[PDB]
Design a protein around this ligand. Structure first.
Ligand SMILES: Nc1ncnc2c1ncn2[C@@H]1O[C@H](COP(=O)(O)OP(=O)(O)O)[C@@H](O)[C@H]1O
Ligand SMILES: Nc1ncnc2c1ncn2[C@@H]1O[C@H](COP(=O)(O)OP(=O)(O)O)[C@@H](O)[C@H]1O
Ligand SMILES: Nc1ncnc2c1ncn2[C@@H]1O[C@H](COP(=O)(O)OP(=O)(O)O)[C@@H](O)[C@H]1O
Ligand SMILES: Nc1ncnc2c1ncn2[C@@H]1O[C@H](COP(=O)(O)OP(=O)(O)O)[C@@H](O)[C@H]1O
Lengths: 157, 49, 325, 37, 357, 307, 616
């Protein structure tokens, strides 16, 4: 049940079902990005195979020349897509007293656009954590679910 | 799409322009007709609309 | 975090009950439910954040009760010994009548108007015909009242007893407000979907009163709910059909006087005939002044205010759930 | 009087002669009274 | 603060700002009068036609209709303030509606009274709302803060609020007035701050009957429109009418078609004896230095009038005793005569001689 | 946007045109220790007031003196900003009339007013801005127009001194005689008939004389005309006519011009502050003729205003 | 020297309180006094004191008095240190707070200036928006890790930073922090925002509030919606929000003309706003019990009550009882399990205007404490409910009083129900049905109790009868709120020459300063202590004569069954339920417990005429 998530589920495969309120505008992340030092004129590449919203990888700091010189070259870099679904528990039950709680999702590549808001779904994912910015305190970190992967209800339509 | 109305409950009965609160702009809000397009629509209380 | 405020009962006159903030950790989490006087045994602290270098003048620290424990006011289910015990009770025929007599104790009521309550509250069979239509498995009670008649209080009983029972009042509103709508959240938050009384109360019992005072916007919602047993929401981008299977129990107020005319019920009250047709059981209440009836009643009321056979309420409110499951 | 005093001004006036006022009456009666036609 | 051309504020209203502003001292405030001019006032009071005289002096441009000028003349002197032990506070307030055929100058009077009365405020019908007449609670926008503003009646506290087209006010409005006319204060519980704040103010309201010529017969009490309860509440209600005197319009045209000459306005009502700046210092003086009491003599005739009307509502009595005491406030009498209550009734009967049709 | 810097002349309708206030070109400070003065030139929207001292005598000293401004010494210019919109005839078939900003310094101030159709001639210069910081490619300019000289269509009476050789321009009209019928006919010749109606409209345009009773109160002062009848007879064309001829004329209709159209709203004023009353219709056109069509359909609240 | 002169003022004051504070001889209260005060405070050892000003002003001829008043903020430290001195001397965890009272003078908030700044003063006004009590430092132990914490001192004036000197060590500094919450002393406090007294404000200037901060055991002494009297400790709080005020505004730019050139500019604007502070807070604004007895003894004092209620008003005799029986309410308690009975009472006066229905109202807001008066139509909304106030700042959820709820367990008086349309009437219904006021707005959800009686004055549809019409149709308020008001006490005035003459006589009498000699058998002041006494009773009828009540209920509906064209109503059981609270009300009136069947009959007939007036 979405209502019940212990803190012992963190970074473990958690599967749960609910109703998606809203899906978000696609964004682009970089799997392969070829970089260049501006002064040094040196060239490199950083290839990030897997990632969650970490942020996973940042540009290096060293090519005097410094602080971090590296210029991303956008013509040779390859990008992918990221959704940010947001899942609410079924409004039916069982708050009875309260505004029903929701979790935030992140879907990469081939898990995008699989889902129209409103479609009842069941997600298998990895419960997890980011810091963000306190809307909170102290040391509190808001939860979210990295999704791998999604098995929709059938159809439902 | 079975809609007996007047439309129900939140759903309008016909094509309607409503705006996206964020980004403003415009979009089709939904309704019986549009969502049901290319097929059957079921209406009741048709005099009560 | 739990915002805990002074219990409104014990307030000394004129001073307002004061929010004080509670923190829960570990096993304490989510145990408490809102709308219940709770107890905490904490350690009162002035922490934190704490900068609050914003204030400045005068130096002021906020306070927070950090909670160790929780004590309920001051959770129910059937059980093997209790059910094996239980079964032997349901065997007598007269149990029905006993139950009805147990169904609305403090009103003194009627045998009829309570009978309807018991019937609809207790259940029905859904019951899906393969694979098409389920008919309906519920009893919708129109309780047509009369000023001064108990018509309100009865349904209030149902909110205490029933498993899932929801009080939507007429409108205006006592939340929830009977119409599923996707609404911007308080403070600053993402948009959450919310059901009306209907969706929220699914499988349970939906309890509404004063239909006549309802704005049409709601009326269509109730009608739809009774008709197809589902509420469809098309706004904003979210598009679904939520499923409310609720039994509707209603309190209605006749147009004008106690009995408006010899004229038929549909003529007697404002609600249109087609919405009324959906209601199977109509409980009319009366009457003209009766000597004995006024005796009998007044003794009971007076008896109540002066204070200052049926099944125990607990076993019946278990009984119902048991049988329905 | 005010119409009179207006017609005067196109004579540039300061005199406000009788034909001015009479003319104002003319405009007034001609305004209406076209409902007899 | 004070001016020669416009009328002087009352003492009772000022109160503390007399009782204070002395201690730290200050200058100006209450208009001061020399000795020999006082000696002129106390002389003019002797003149018998005074009560008539001032009435012609109020509106110089405006012709005839003397009893309107006159009732308003008493609106300027209105009432006597009473605190009892505590509470009380009936003030001096007297309130006047007037209706009639259009183009009757009913608005001109409003302009004039507006000009004389020190603190008054002038409002049109439909340009008004119950929020507009008190307590705006606007954002200040200079400091980006929420600051309370005084509504139009609160400002008008003291002196005279003037109202256009009173018949035409929206139904939610006029619900403000049932508060003011009776209580003499307004009670605001809304929004930020919850208090009952004082607006003590006369009201002069203009009305246009449905006709708009209100026409012979018909019930008049019907033909002013209004709810009759509110309508009975007004102290003195003028109904102005044209009997088409022949024999009038010629005289009136002699009055208005003048100017003409001079182009630079002079000798308006002349030849007529008129005070100009004298009547304002007179009126002021009358207001601060006199506090009339009706003593014994009045009460008999005073009551029998009220009964004679009853044979209407009790307010009409309240009216008489307040309106009359204004008359007696004038003429520099600390005590009312048994006389002077006669016309004080007649003014109410004046509209009745106009209610015959 | 290729004309930036040039001296250009535009024609459009003035709108808005906020209050004139002192803007400061150079600021004077007084060291008070070394004596002297310190004049900083000032540009764009804001500046930072200098401190310590720039005095040649307070340079290289151990102790720099402190200085503070004197508003009497500094050089102020009268600043007024006004927007102009496309004349609405010149708009291409689709789209919408655009707006453009203008600045006014020194003497030309106050020469401009809303509801005016005008030829403005000024040297056209850019001033640094962009939208949300993340919305700029850079550097952009956002521009504006500067105002050297103003030439107004429909020149505005009653204000002129002379009546020098212009009387000559009056006399061709006078000498022929029978000015009244001539002008009368000369209002809206575009339509046939109704010489009486026009005969009166001439008076309407002229007006006068009002009066002052010396106390004083006023008596208008002007003429109020109605044109009844239907459906044809082309009554409204006379009103487009007049509102075209008369300066400070404004044409409105009932549903149309809202009640808030005639009354003045309170709205926050950009740049100079704050919360200025902006009116329309009646206030917008006053001292001159206002024109109304469909005078029946105006409902109620409007009729009270006009009443 | 300034140290020495100030210290002299110390010794002078200390000598004062040690010198005789009392001239009272023989029977007393014989000397001292204040020693007796130190010791009486030593009884419960709560460590704060109260000492009168008047004495101190009188003793020294006032040189000391003025020396205290004018420079008082200068002279705090010497004073409380002096008290500490005497305490050390005659008495054996040190927190001391000294609060004078009974000043010779009162100053209006509008009469506050900056010349009285930093100096003790007296200010009376209507308290608004109290705020929950939060701790404060003024003594803190804060230091860096290096080399040691536990240094405890300073932060005296509001800053709140920082350690004054002898940093670090050995890192000696400058530096800053670190602050412990494990070691420090805290006190109080609650902030309250006081408003100018409604009656005083100069036209049309409209009220302006000021802010008064409560530190000391003076905490919580203040009450929302109440007149109070404060003594000065006046001071200042700085304000960022004043900009574009306009100027010219003063600044801090530092003088660096010392040292030498080889910090930057360091400029900080100083813009202050006056906000009063409070040491002392009062709610101002045996021999008697004999009188109370004398009241309960007599058999007529009921009738005395009734006749003496509203002198201004002439007769009617109905609404007199109608008004008083609200002041004295039922048991409003039990019956459990369960839902609680009502309890309290309600009335709505209806009639053709000029009937002076409002005079009652004004008399109630005049007479009884805990009474709010609004004229709504302008309620406008809440008004009768709470905002709730957000933000504060620092967590907010502070609650406005306000209107209806700030009068609690009391009588709220509203003119003209018929003007407030739909929106608020529903809220009132929520108040008189659920008895609780539930408040949730864009923020913290809440429930706030209001248990109140509501006296309304409602004008008829046409302001008239309509005798022939059903009252049901006349009053024009919705059914559910209608059925909760028991009962209406309708008045219509009709012409009777005796009564007419009596009115004209009585009114002219009123507007005559003489004779104002018209007087009630009870004085307006005593009737309050009487009532408050009569409130302490828990009238309970066990008595089986209650059986009779049934037939009385029963006698009431039968004759009123046919025709239905009579005043019905029904008569609703809620009227049986009403007879109860009425009975208990009359019990409150007559001090009698378990009452009488007779009083029951009185409440009964009362309801009866209230019915017949509806008949026509
Ligand atoms: N016979 C009775 N015994 C006990 N209580 C009763 C009886 N009849 C009515 N009541 C009480 O009177 C109240 C009547 O309210 P009701 O008329 O039902 O509300 P509404 O008119 O708003 O629907 C009920 O709450 C009920 O508790
Ligand atoms: N008796 C009078 N004396 C002087 N002027 C008058 C008199 N009667 C009418 N007038 C003139 O006629 C006009 C009256 O207009 P007004 O009465 O304000 O219109 P309305 O009656 O519709 O309010 C004023 O300009 C006024 O000067
Ligand atoms: N005497 C005339 N001379 C020229 N055009 C006329 C004449 N009479 C009528 N018209 C025409 O009739 C039309 C009426 O237009 P308009 O004034 O807008 O509507 P209305 O007929 O309601 O006044 C005008 O376009 C005009 O061309
Ligand atoms: N019995 C009375 N006692 C005192 N004053 C009365 C009485 N009857 C009438 N009045 C007068 O009537 C006025 C009150 O009118 P009121 O009936 O309150 O009008 P409304 O019904 O609009 O409130 C008061 O100013 C008062 O002087």
């Amino acid at each position: 049940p979405l209502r019940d998530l212990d803190s012992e589920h963190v970074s473990k495969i958690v599967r749960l079902s609910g109703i998606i309120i809203s899906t978000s505008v696609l964004s682009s992340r970089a799997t392969y990005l070829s970089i260049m030092c501006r002064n040094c004129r040196h060239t490199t590449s950083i290839t990030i195979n897997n990632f969650n919203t970490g942020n996973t990888v940042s540009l290096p700091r060293s090519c005097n020349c410094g602080p971090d010189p590296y210029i991303i070259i956008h013509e040779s870099s390859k990008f992918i897509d990221q959704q940010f679904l947001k899942l609410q528990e079924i409004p039916e039950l069982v708050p009875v007293g309260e505004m029903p709680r929701n979790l935030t999702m992140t879907c990469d590549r081939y898990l995008t656009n699989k889902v129209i808001p409103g479609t009842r779904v069941t997600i298998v994912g990895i419960y997890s954590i980011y810091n963000s910015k306190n809307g909170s305190g102290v040391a509190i970190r808001t939860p979210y679910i990295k999704i791998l992967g999604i098995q929709s209800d059938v159809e439902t339509s | 799409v079975y809609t007996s109305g007047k439309g129900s409950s939140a759903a309008g009965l016909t094509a309607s322009v409503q705006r996206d609160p964020m980004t403003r702009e415009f979009y089709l809000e939904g309704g019986a007709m549009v969502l049901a397009d290319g097929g059957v629509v079921c209406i009741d209380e048709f005099d009560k609309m | 975090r739990v915002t805990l405020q002074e219990a409104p009962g014990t307030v000394p006159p004129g001073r307002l009950p004061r929010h004080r903030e509670v923190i829960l950790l570990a096993d304490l989490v989510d145990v408490s439910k809102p709308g219940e006087e709770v107890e905490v045994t904490g350690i009162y602290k002035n922490n934190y954040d704490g900068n609050l270098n914003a204030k400045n003048g005068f130096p002021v620290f906020a306070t927070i009760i950090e909670a160790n424990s929780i004590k309920r006011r001051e959770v129910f289910s059937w059980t093997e010994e209790e059910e094996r015990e239980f079964r032997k009770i349901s065997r007598d025929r007269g149990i029905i009548d006993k139950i009805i007599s147990s169904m609305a104790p403090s009103i003194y009521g009627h045998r009829d108007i309570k009978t309807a309550v018991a019937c609809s509250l207790f259940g029905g069979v859904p019951k899906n015909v393969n694979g098409k239509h389920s008919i309906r498995g519920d009893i919708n009670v129109l309780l047509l009242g009369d000023p001064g008649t108990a018509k309100s209080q009865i349904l209030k009983y149902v909110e205490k007893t029933a498993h899932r029972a929801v009080f939507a009042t007429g409108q205006g509103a006592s939340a929830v407000g009977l119409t599923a709508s996707v609404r911007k959240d308080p403070i600053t938050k993402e948009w959450t979907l919310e059901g009306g009384a209907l969706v929220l109360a699914d499988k349970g019992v939906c309890l509404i009163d004063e239909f006549d005072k309802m704005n049409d916007q709601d009326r269509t919602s109730i009608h739809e709910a009774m008709e197809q047993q589902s509420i469809s929401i098309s706004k904003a981008g979210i598009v679904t059909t939520l499923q409310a299977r609720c039994s509707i129990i209603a309190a209605a107020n006749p147009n004008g006087g106690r009995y408006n005319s010899t004229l038929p019920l549909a003529q007697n009250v404002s609600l249109t005939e087609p919405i009324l047709s959906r209601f199977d059981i109509l409980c009319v209440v009366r009457d003209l002044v009766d000597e004995e009836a006024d005796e009998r009643l007044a003794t009971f009321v007076v008896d109540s205010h002066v204070r200052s056979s049926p099944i125990p309420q607990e076993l019946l409110m278990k009984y119902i759930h048991y049988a329905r499951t | 009087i005010r119409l009179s005093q207006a017609l005067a001004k196109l004579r540039l006036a300061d005199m406000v002669d009788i034909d001015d006022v009479e003319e104002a009456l003319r405009l007034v009666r001609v305004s209406k009274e076209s409902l007899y036609q | 603060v004070s001016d020669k051309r416009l009328d002087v504020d009352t003492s009772t209203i000022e109160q503390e700002l007399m009782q204070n502003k002395v201690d730290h001292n200050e200058v100006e405030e209450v208009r001061q009068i020399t000795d020999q001019d006082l000696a002129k006032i106390r002389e003019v009071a002797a003149r018998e036609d005074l009560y008539s005289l001032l009435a012609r002096s109020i509106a110089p441009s405006i012709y005839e209709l003397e009893d309107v000028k006159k009732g308003i003349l008493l609106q300027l002197f209105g009432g006597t303030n009473k605190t009892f032990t505590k509470g009380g506070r009936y003030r001096g307030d007297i309130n006047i509606l007037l209706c009639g055929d259009p183009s009757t100058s009913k608005s001109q009077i409003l302009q004039y009274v507006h000009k004389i009365t020190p603190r008054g405020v002038y409002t049109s019908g439909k340009g008004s709302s119950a929020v507009g007449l008190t307590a705006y609670i606007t954002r200040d926008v200079d400091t980006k803060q929420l600051v309370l503003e005084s509504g139009a009646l609160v400002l008008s506290d003291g002196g005279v609020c003037c109202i256009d087209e009173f018949d035409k006010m929206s139904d939610s409005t006029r619900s403000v007035l049932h508060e003011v006319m009776e209580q003499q204060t307004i009670s605001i519980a809304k929004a930020g701050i919850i208090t009952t704040l004082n607006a003590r103010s006369s009201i002069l309201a203009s009305a246009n009957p449905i006709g708009s010529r209100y026409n012979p017969n018909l019930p008049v009490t019907e033909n002013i429109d209004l709810p009759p309860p509110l309508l009975s509440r007004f102290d003195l209600v003028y109904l102005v009418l044209d009997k088409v005197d022949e024999k009038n319009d010629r005289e009136l045209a002699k009055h208005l078609t003048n100017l003409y000459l001079e182009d630079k306005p002079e000798h308006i009502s002349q030849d007529d004896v008129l005070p100009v700046e004298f009547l304002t210092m007179y009126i002021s003086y009358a207001k601060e230095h006199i506090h009339p009491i009706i003593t014994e003599a009045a009460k008999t005739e005073l009551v029998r009038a009220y009964v004679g009307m009853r044979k209407a509502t009790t307010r009409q009595l309240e009216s008489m005793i307040r309106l009359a005491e204004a008359h007696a406030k004038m003429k520099l009498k600390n005590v009312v005569e048994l006389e002077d209550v006669q016309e004080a009734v007649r003014l109410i009967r004046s509209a009745i001689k106009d209610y015959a049709t | 946007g290729d004309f930036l810097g040039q001296l250009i002349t535009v024609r459009g309708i003035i709108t808005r045109v906020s209050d004139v206030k002192p803007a400061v070109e150079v600021i004077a400070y007084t060291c008070d220790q070394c004596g002297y003065e310190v004049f900083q030139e000032v540009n764009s929207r804001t500046f930072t007031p200098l401190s310590e001292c720039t005095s040649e005598e307070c340079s290289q000293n151990q102790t720099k003196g402190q200085l503070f401004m004197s508003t009497r010494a500094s050089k102020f210019s009268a600043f007024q900003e006004c927007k102009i919109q496309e004349l609405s005839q010149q708009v291409p078939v689709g789209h919408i009339p655009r707006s453009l900003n203008i600045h006014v310094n020194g003497t030309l101030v106050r020469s401009l007013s809303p509801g005016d159709i005008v030829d403005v001639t000024g040297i056209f210069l850019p001033a640094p801005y962009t939208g949300f910081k993340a919305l700029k490619a850079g550097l952009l300019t956002e521009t504006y127009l500067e105002a050297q000289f103003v030439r107004q269509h429909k020149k505005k009476f009653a204000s002129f001194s002379l009546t020098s050789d212009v009387e000559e321009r009056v006399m061709e009209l006078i000498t022929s005689g029978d000015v009244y019928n001539r002008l009368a006919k000369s209002i809206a010749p575009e339509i046939y008939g109704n010489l009486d109606v026009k005969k009166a409209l001439l008076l309407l345009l002229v007006g006068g004389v009002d009066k002052r009773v010396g106390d004083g109160m006023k008596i208008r002062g002007d003429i109020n005309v109605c044109l009844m009848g239907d459906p044809g007879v082309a009554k409204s064309q006379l009103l487009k006519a007049i509102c075209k001829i008369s300066p400070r004329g404004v044409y409105t209709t009932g549903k149309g011009s809202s009640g808030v159209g005639l009354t003045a709203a309170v709205m926050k004023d950009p740049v100079t502050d704050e919360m200025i009353l902006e009116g329309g219709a009646l206030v917008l056109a006053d001292n001159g003729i206002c024109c109304i069509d469909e005078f029946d359909k105006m409902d109620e609240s409007d009729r009270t205003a006009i009443h | 020297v300034d140290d020495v002169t100030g210290e002299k003022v110390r010794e002078a004051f200390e000598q004062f309180l040690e010198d005789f504070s009392v001239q009272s001889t023989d029977t007393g209260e014989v000397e001292k006094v204040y020693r007796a005060q130190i010791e009486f405070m030593k009884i419960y050892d709560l460590n704060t004191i109260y000492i009168d000003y008047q004495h101190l002003s009188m003793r020294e001829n006032g040189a000391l008095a003025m020396a205290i008043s004018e420079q008082y903020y200068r002279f705090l430290p010497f004073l409380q240190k002096g008290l500490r001195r005497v305490v050390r001397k005659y008495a054996p965890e040190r927190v001391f707070q000294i609060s004078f009272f009974n000043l010779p003078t009162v100053h209006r908030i509008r009469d506050i200036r900056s010349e009285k700044i930093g100096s003790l003063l007296s200010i009376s006004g209507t308290v608004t928006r109290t705020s929950e009590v939060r701790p404060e430092l003024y003594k803190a132990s804060f230091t860096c890790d290096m080399c040691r914490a536990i240094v405890d001192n300073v932060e005296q004036s509001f800053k709140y930073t920082e350690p004054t000197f002898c940093p670090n060590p050995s890192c000696e500094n400058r530096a800053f922090w670190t602050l412990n919450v494990t070691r420090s002393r805290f006190l109080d406090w609650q902030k309250v925002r006081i408003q100018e007294n409604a009656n005083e404000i100069p036209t049309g200037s409209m009220p302006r509030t000021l802010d008064v901060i409560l530190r000391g055991d003076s905490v919580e002494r203040a009450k929302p919606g109440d007149r109070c009297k404060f003594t000065g400790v006046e001071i200042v709080v700085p304000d960022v929000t004043q900009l574009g005020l306009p100027g010219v505004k003063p600044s801090s730019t530092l003088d660096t003309r010392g040292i030498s050139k080889t910090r930057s500019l360091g400029v900080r604007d100083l813009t202050y706003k006056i906000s009063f502070l409070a040491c002392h807070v009062i709610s101002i604004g045996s021999d008697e019990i004999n009188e109370l007895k004398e009241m309960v003894k007599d058999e007529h004092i009921y009738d005395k009550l009734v006749r003496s209620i509203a002198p201004a008003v002439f007769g009617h005799e109905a609404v007199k009882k109608g008004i008083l029986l609200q002041m004295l309410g039922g048991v409003h308690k039990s019956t459990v399990e369960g839902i609680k009975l009502r309890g309290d009472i309600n009335i709505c006066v209806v009639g053709d205007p000029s009937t002076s229905k409002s005079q009652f109202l004004k008399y109630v807001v005049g007479f009884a404490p805990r009474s709010v008066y609004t004229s709504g139509k302008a309620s406008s909304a809440a008004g009768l409910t709470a905002a709730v106030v957000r933000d504060e700042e620092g967590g907010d959820y502070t609650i406005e009083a306000g209107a209806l709820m700030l009068a609690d367990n009391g009588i709220c008086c509203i003119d003209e129900f018929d003007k407030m349309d739909i929106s608020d009437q529903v809220a009132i219904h929520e108040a008189m049905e659920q008895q609780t006021i539930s408040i949730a707005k864009a923020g913290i959800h809440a429930t706030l109790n209001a248990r109140t009686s509501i006296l309304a004055a409602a004008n008829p549809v046409g302001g008239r009868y309509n005798r022939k019409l059903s009252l049901r149709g006349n009053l024009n308020m919705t059914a559910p709120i209608m059925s909760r008001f028991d009962l209406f006490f309708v008045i219509l005035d009709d012409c009777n020459e005796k009564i007419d003459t009596e009115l004209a006589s009585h009114i002219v009498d009123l507007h005559m300063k003489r004779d104002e000699a018209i007087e009630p058998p009870f004085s307006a002041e005593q009737l309050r202590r009487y009532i408050k006494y009569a409130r302490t009773f828990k009238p309970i009828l066990t008595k089986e004569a209650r059986s009779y009540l049934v037939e009385k209920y029963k006698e009431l509906r039968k004759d009123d069954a046919q025709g239905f064209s009579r005043s019905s109503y029904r008569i609703t059981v809620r009227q049986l339920e009403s007879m109860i609270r009425l009975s208990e009300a009359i019990a409150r009136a007559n001090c009698v417990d378990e009452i009488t069947p007779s009083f029951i009959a009185e409440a009964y007939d009362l309801l009866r005429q209230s019915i017949i007036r509806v008949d026509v």
